[PDB]
Amino acid sequence: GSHSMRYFFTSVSRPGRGEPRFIAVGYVDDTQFVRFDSDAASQRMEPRAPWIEQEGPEYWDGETRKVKAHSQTHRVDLGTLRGYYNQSEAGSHTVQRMYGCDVGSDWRFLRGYHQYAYDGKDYIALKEDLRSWTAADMAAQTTKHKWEAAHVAEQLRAYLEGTCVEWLRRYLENGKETLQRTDAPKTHMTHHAVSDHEATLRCWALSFYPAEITLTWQRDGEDQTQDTELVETRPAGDGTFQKWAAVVVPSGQEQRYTCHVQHEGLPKPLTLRWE
């Protein structure tokens, strides 16, 4: 019954010319709802879900202003970090930032988080209590001390425990028809011979939301991981997700095998067996 609102920011320097490429995306759970791309002509935060199009011009003006400010921070950071790390001006580098808040089933603040990476590695993060920082290396210790002096954690916590949660609750209600609906996986099994004496059984989970799922094969009631294969969970493109898991078995012994599906949209896990 918990939900999250999360923002993802990526800035990539362009050493040959110009300012960094900056992309921001916002999500509720596994649903993207807004974006900003510095390479787009609008230079505005833009809607990506129908329920956020309910918001009026003042929303779009404020989100645009704030996200452009985030872009400038990252631009400064890329220059600073090049100096912290004694790097050349010739390479392209990347800053990534993710932050967000969760509410529980009681619709109250549950947890917050704020993470920052440089060149795809941890740089600095808020600790779980939202009151102190984890610095990954000695460069990040500079940042930690600067941020402690300027009481940055308290400022972030104010948003994560306050405004952040208020937005999430507004979005959940406005987008209830989708954001608060679970789509249980549509499941089925296929069978095909791989020889005159063996067959593959493939268990499919389709059209499910949210993305978290578990598919497990069993033989005579116990977990079977040998002779199995799978794919990583993947987006269908319509907002739902897909996954499959397969096992090779002796022909004629199919009935020994069961595929077990766990998903939050299922009141109890499903068990599938071939004919």
Partner: peptide
């Protein structure tokens, strides 16, 4: 809605 407080650089 995005963070609405003061921005801080590394």
């Amino acid at each position: 809605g995005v963070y609405d407080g003061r921005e801080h650089t590394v």
